[PDB]
Amino acid sequence: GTAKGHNPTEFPTIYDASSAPTAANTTVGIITIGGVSQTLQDLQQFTSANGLASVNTQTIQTGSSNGDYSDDQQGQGEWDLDSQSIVGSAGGAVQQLLFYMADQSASGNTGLTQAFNQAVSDNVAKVINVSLGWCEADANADGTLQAEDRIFATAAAQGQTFSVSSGDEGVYECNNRGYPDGSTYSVSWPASSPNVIAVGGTTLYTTSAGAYSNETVWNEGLDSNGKLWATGGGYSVYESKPSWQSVVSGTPGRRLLPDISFDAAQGTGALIYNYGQLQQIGGTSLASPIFVGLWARLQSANSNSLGFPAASFYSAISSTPSLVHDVKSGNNGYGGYGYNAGTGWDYPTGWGSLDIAKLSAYIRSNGF
Numbered sequence: 001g002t003a004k005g006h007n008p009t010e011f012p013t014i015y016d017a018s019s020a021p022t023a024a025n026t027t028v029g030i031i032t033i034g035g036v037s038q039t040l041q042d043l044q045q046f047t048s049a050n051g052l053a054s055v056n057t058q059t060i061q062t063g064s065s066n067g068d069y070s071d072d073q074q075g076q077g078e079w080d081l082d083s084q085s086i087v088g089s090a091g092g093a094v095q096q097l098l099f100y101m102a103d104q105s106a107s108g109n110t111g112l113t114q115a116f117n118q119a120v121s122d123n124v125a126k127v128i129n130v131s132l133g134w135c136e137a138d139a140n141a142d143g144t145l146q147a148e149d150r151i152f153a154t155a156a157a158q159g160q161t162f163s164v165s166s167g168d169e170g171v172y173e174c175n176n177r178g179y180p181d182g183s184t185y186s187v188s189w190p191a192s193s194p195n196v197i198a199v200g201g202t203t204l205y206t207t208s209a210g211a212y213s214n215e216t217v218w219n220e221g222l223d224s225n226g227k228l229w230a231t232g233g234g235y236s237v238y239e240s241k242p243s244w245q246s247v248v249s250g251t252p253g254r255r256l257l258p259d260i261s262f263d264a265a266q267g268t269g270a271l272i273y274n275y276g277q278l279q280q281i282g283g284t285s286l287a288s289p290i291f292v293g294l295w296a297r298l299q300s301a302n303s304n305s306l307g308f309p310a311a312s313f314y315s316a317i318s319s320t321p322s323l324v325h326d327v328k329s330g331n332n333g334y335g336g337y338g339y340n341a342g343t344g345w346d347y348p349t350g351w352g353s354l355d356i357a358k359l360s361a362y363i364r365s366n367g368f
């Protein structure tokens with residue numbers, strides 16, 4: 001297998017989803033900070049280049065009608081990554097793509113919170129992508145965690161799936177966002193929520209012909225600033241373990257994360273149009289939208305009748321190892337520190353990545 005960049009349109013064949021329907025009958029959401037004007041141009045570039053049918057989009061101002069929904073330039077890169085990866089992974093079509101735009105003028109974390117809130121209150125997107133986060137402890141300190149979890153709980157109860165990136169700072173989320181801190185480990189919010197699916201990151205290897213070859217932990221070491229780039233993983237210091245997680249024995253009574261993982265290494269990352277320019281981008285910010293696109297196909301396959309799938313993932317995969325690619329090699333730390341991947345569920349990658357056709361069949365026979 002080879003480490004290389006990938007067009008989003010290749011993820012269905014890498015993760016075994018070509019024989020499933022596209023997401024044409026499922027509506028998908030994406031949370032952003034600020035506007036997406038350039039993003040929408042970039043998205044036009046993407047569908048046209050790949051010869052795809054255009055995507056029906058909507059943009060929503062989730063807060064004050066006088067708030068700041070101007071484009072954030074660095075932001076467009078994320079929303080680019082998110083939207084192109086979702087649509088590629090979905091097999092090239094979604095019913096509609098909604099951009100839930102957070103007000104940039106709002107106080108504290110209130111803009112983001114209202115954006116989560118509008119997606120939930122409208123209840124039209126079945127799956128919503130969240131490619132962002134920060135130190136859960138900071139979120140806890142100022143009341144943001146409590147506020148946002150109420151909203152995710154409502155989502156789960158109404159059958160909506162929020163997908164959240166686990167982080168890109170490995171075990172060192174709360175140390176200046178990724179600076180090595182020896183044996184001191186932390187995690188990112190909102191991934192640590194039990195009411196969302198947390199998606200970690202892999203190093204993705206492919207055959208010459210482009211088939212799946214294997215996956216190791218995402219960990220590309222330190223940048224020139226001294227910051228670690230690797231998959232977020234561990235357990236929450238605040239959130240209690242949901243009981244479906246009890247099948248992972250020998251772990252504390254806390255929410256363990258991530259749940260599942262997909263491609264995240266920049267070296268094996270996605271090729272994305274940004275301000276008209278193709279760039280090779282990675283992170284758990286990529287793995288999450290790959291899951292969202294794949295999961296949107298299974299909804300389309302099941303008349304969008306699949307509720308919040310955490311409990312089901314844990315029971316099905318623990319009893320059916322063929323449903324996933326089990327990551328077994330690497331760590332999400334530095335200098336000897338960090339968690340190591342291993343047989344079955346582990347802290348850097350969770351259950352690993354999903355084999356979609358096999359999951360599809362399982363659901364055929366057993367429901368989800």
Ligand SMILES: [Ca+2]
Nearest residue numbers: 327342343344
């Ligand atoms: Ca494993």
